């Protein structure tokens, strides 16, 4: 029985681990490393809740300044076992959240894209739409769509906060109607992988009104 974590928590862990590796490689001052080892150790400690033997050992390995890439890959592979993947809704539910969209169907998904996903977004060309589904803080299924512009620009995604290939996403409020939004990753799978803080996603959702 492994304690359960969210995909974004996994992504955050992957994130701090790679950063730690970089600190081991490129930073000299010993005390800065100690503060960082301890912080990272705490961040992971804080996410999991309780240490089980695998987590204690992974941490022991992470805490070695001689940490290797192969070791990282083993640790990441193990942390993944703790993640509760995004749950795709049934077609009948998907259809009920997009009541006015006749002829809608989720595109095929990799379960392991799903282990890093906080939300699901896919683009439909004829419509110039990106559809997004997610579960809110109450775990209820929600869905929306918006216009995603053709132009790709190199910029920080409003959702994942990473410098990426982004496009302007605009949502029409209930209808004479209003249009709101901002730049987000054109490729939402990649977006989900970079998303380490789900509040940013929910904040993006709130700004769309
Ligand atoms: Zn993004």
140 CA to middle of ligand 1, Å? 22
Task: Say if CB 106 and CB 120 are below 8 A apart.
Answer: yes
Report how far apart, in Å, the C-alpha atoms of 148 and of each of 84, 155, 187 are. 29, 15, 11
Which one, of 46, 45, 26, lies nearest residue 58 by Cα?
45
Q: Is 61 annotated as a binding residue?
A: no
As a whole number of angstroms, the longest Cα–Cα distance in the chain is 62
DSSP-assigned states of every residue in 14-45:
HHHHHHHHHHHHH---HHHHHHHHHHHHHHHH
Taking the C-alpha atoms of 5, 22, 112 and 107 in order, what is their torsion angle to the nearest 10 degrees?
110
| 61-69 CB contacts, 8 Å cutoff, 24+ apart | 62/17, 62/20, 63/37, 65/24, 65/33, 67/20, 67/21, 67/24, 69/21
Q: At what angle do helices 69-79 and 7-26 cross, to 10 degrees?
A: 160
187 CA to middle of ligand 1, Å? 8
Which one, of 5, 9, 11, lies nearest residue 194 by Cα?
11
Counting Cα atoms < 13 Å in the Cβ hemisphere of 59 gives 19
Resolution in A: 2.3
146 Cβ contact partners less than 8 Å away, ≥ 6 residues apart? 129, 130, 132, 169, 170, 171, 172, 181, 208
Task: Say if CB 119 and CB 199 are below 8 A apart.
Answer: no
Domain ranges of the chain: 1-85, 86-209
Beta strand spans in 149-188 (E): 153-156, 163-172, 179-185
Task: Say if CB 73 and CB 79 are below 8 A apart.
Answer: no
If you count them, how many residues does the chain have?
Answer: 209
For the CA atoms of the chain, what is the radius of gyration? 19
**Any idea which residue has 């992974």 for tokens?**
58
CA 47 to chain centre: 15
Fold annotation for 1-85:
Monooxygenase (1.20.1280)
CA angle 80, 138, 107 (to 5 degrees): 55
- Residue 107: phi and psi, rounded to 5, are -80, 160
Q: Is 187 annotated as a binding residue?
A: no
Task: Say if CB 119 and CB 188 are below 8 A apart.
Answer: yes
CA–CA dist 133, 98 (Å, integer): 10
Method: X-ray
CA–CA dist 98, 87 (Å, integer): 17
CA–CA dist 121, 145 (Å, integer): 9
CA–CA dist 79, 71 (Å, integer): 12
Report how far apart, in Å, the C-alpha atoms of 1 and of each of 50, 52, 54, 82 are. 12, 10, 12, 9
159 CA to middle of ligand 1, Å? 5
91 CA to middle of ligand 1, Å? 26
174 Cβ contact partners less than 8 Å away, ≥ 6 residues apart? none
């Amino acid at each position: 029985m492994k304690t359960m974590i969210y995909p974004h928590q996994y992504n955050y862990i992957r994130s701090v681990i790679l950063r730690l590796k970089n600190v081991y490689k490129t930073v000299n001052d010993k005390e800065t490393v100690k503060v960082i080892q301890s912080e990272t150790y705490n961040d992971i400690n804080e996410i999991f809740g309780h240490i089980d033997d695998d987590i204690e050992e992974s941490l022991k390995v992470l805490m070695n300044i001689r940490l290797s890439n192969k070791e990282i890959e083993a640790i990441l592979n193990k942390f993944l076992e703790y993640v509760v993947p995004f749950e795709l809704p049934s077609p009948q539910k998907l259809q009920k959240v997009f009541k006015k969209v006749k002829k809608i169907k989720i595109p095929q998904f990799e379960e392991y894209d799903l282990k890093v996903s906080s939300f699901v977004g896919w683009n439909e060309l004829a419509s110039n739409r990106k559809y997004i589904i997610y579960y809110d803080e109450k775990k209820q299924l929600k869905g929306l769509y918006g216009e995603i512009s053709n132009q790709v620009v190199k910029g920080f995604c409003t959702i994942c906060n990473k410098e990426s290939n982004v496009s302007l996403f605009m949502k029409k409020s209930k209808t004479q109607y209003v249009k709101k939004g901002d730049y987000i990753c054109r490729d939402s799978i990649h977006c989900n992988k970079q998303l380490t803080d789900i509040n940013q996603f929910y904040n993006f959702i709130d700004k769309l009104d």
